[PDB]
Amino acid sequence: TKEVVVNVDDDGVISLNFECDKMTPKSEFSWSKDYVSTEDSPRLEVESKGNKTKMTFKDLGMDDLGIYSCDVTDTDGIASSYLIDEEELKRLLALSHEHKFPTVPVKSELAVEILEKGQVRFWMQAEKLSGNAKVNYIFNEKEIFEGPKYKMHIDRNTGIIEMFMEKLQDEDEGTYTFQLQDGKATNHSTVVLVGDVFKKLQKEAEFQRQEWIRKQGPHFVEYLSWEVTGECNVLLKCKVANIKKETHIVWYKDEREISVDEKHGICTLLITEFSKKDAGIYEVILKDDRGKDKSRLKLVDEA
Structure with missing residues (x-):
């Protein structure tokens, strides 16, 4: 049957949980740490209700290392236990943190290329987006918007996020960031276009755009x-x-x-x-x- 079972809730709250189906009108839960009663401990709290108990740590750290045991009186006299060592302390702290501050997964980072009209494509791929996901776009630490100059598309099914430009002016040299927010989750991807890299791209845009027009004619x-x-x-x-x-x-x-x-x-x-x-x-x-x-x-x- 049953063991003590750990839980980290959506708010990062860490707890041990236990239930016993074979209790008597006089049965009671009692928790110990390293085989000493945890009654009165400032580091934790207990709550019992019907056939269930929960021990909530107030601020899990290094002074909580040990074996936690649950005994139930008027039963078979057998205890269930859970080991908290240094490696299990890490795992639980990482889980708590990521609940409170989730990350939106990224499959590939912000990259930039030249398409076929001599159009400039900025793009990245998230692993998955809900329908509520949104993006903000940033150039040299100022926010930029949908208009005569920047045109932006997001496909929520594939997680492809795009910004298109028609050409690169000299004043477009610098740093670009996509900022992603889905639930309470969050991420950003960044690309630096400065020096050789920038005029490598700007030169190539120019040439292809001219070539494409010339070719629609005779x-x-x-x-x-x-x-x-x-x-x-x-x-x-x-x-x-x-x-x-x-x-x-x-x-x-x-x-x-x-x-x-x-x-x-x-x-x-x-x-x-x-x-x-x-x-x-x-x-x-x-x-x-x-x-x-x-x-x-x-x-x-x-x-």
Whole structure:
């Protein structure tokens, strides 16, 4: 049957508990420490009610080490006991503390990356969130909010917490913290973006954002090169992508339109019987409402 059984309640309160089903109108609980009566001890309290007892420690510490025993009079004369040694003192103190001040578990800490539009993603993963969980966001020890600049999402099912930015200004260098609060539980994760790390990220954001826009338009996959063909003609060549019907393709030599394209992603201009007269700065421009691109190439005919 029964032993003495320990309990730590939601408020950190530590206690030993006992019940006996075989009591008599004259039966009584009596507790001892190291086989001396604990009656009158300032370190603890007892409460008996019907067939149950509880001993509540007032402030568990090192002066409470020992064997606690419970005897019941008018029974079989057998005592139940519980050992409190130095290792069990630690375990119970840790449990009390974590009840009073629980921690919200974290699977991975606050990290920062560059997504595909050149968008900046700040993220972390908690182990689990209730539906009441909330976050506050902090940059250089000041609170920041949902608006034109910071946009924030929390999925409570997976514990993914996110903040998005469109780019990194110079004034965005510094320290970022997510502060998490679920019940009476609590945590925070922090990331430092200073120096090399910060401009590593800011440079990469910039480049990808530009690239992504250029590419929604009609654009180059290979820039202007040259070769020789036929009877001493020069052909100019490039490669293009994302070409529509209304797309204007236009050639120039020294600021002066020469040819307008329409025919057929290879683009060529043929230069007939090449000489000094054919030298100059050549360029091709691509255009419509989705954006414009450009390739340039300089041609010397012996200067």
